[PDB]
Amino acid sequence: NIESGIAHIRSTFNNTIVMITDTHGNALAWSSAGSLGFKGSRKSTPFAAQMAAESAAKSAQEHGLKTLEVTVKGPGSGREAAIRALQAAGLEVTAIKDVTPVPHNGCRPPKRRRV
RNA sequence: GAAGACUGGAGUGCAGAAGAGGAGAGUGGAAUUCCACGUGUAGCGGUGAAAUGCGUAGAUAUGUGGAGGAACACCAGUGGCG
Ligand SMILES: [Mg+2]
Ligand SMILES: [Mg+2]
């Protein structure tokens, strides 16, 4: 019995996580690639992202909602599968906003690999 | 070498110009970490594959607030100063 939810998709090189929340920040249900029962490196596949997004949409619809807002972060490739699954589950999306955090030359990054 | 004479060298005068040149004091935003509190449940992280590791004493995620330190995205350019 909540409308106007928000979806947070965190898709990285190793996993993807979908958070469904109210318009304020209180979570309702969540689903991750490993929560579906997947193995390790297989979590990065966009197929697992599609499955996780479908599961999150179904769990959100169990309590019922109509519209949704999409926030984007992470460098993973499971983004498109997640957003298309959210579209196909019956939820309309007002807009997609990217919230990938970029610093203004803040803390130094860890050293490059194979050195 | 000595005594004179002259401005091309050199320097001063007068009028403008540009610059991350140097020292001192104060301030700003983005982000990371830690702490406290709401929502929420079983994984998160990582790799060529894994595992050590954190997590039901309740993470990862998300919202609010607080503490502190370091570095200054776009401008940015075989551009500039020494
Ligand atoms: Mg001259
Ligand atoms: Mg938190």
- Distances in whole angstroms, Cα of residue A33 to Cα of each of A20, A45, A58, A86, A101: 15, 9, 15, 15, 22
DSSP code of A73? E
CA of A7 to the centre of ligand 1 (A): 74
Q: Find the ligand nearest to A25 CA.
A: 2
Beta strands per DSSP E along chain A: 5-11, 16-21, 27-32, 67-73, 92-98
User: For residue A105, which amino acid is it?
Assistant: N
The technique by which this structure was obtained is: cryo-EM
Q: What is the C-alpha separation between A65 and A4, in angstroms, rounded?
A: 7
Burial of A40 (0-12, 13-18, 19+ CB in 10 A): exposed
Q: In whole angstroms, give the CA distance from residue A5 to residue A73.
A: 18
CA distance A103 to A21: 26
Per-residue CA distances from A109 to A101, A105, A106 (Å):
14, 10, 9
Which positions 59-78 on chain A have a beta carbon less than 7 angstroms from any atom of strand B?
Answer: 73
Q: Which residues pair with A29 in a beta bridge?
A: A20
Q: Give the resolution value in Å.
A: 3.0
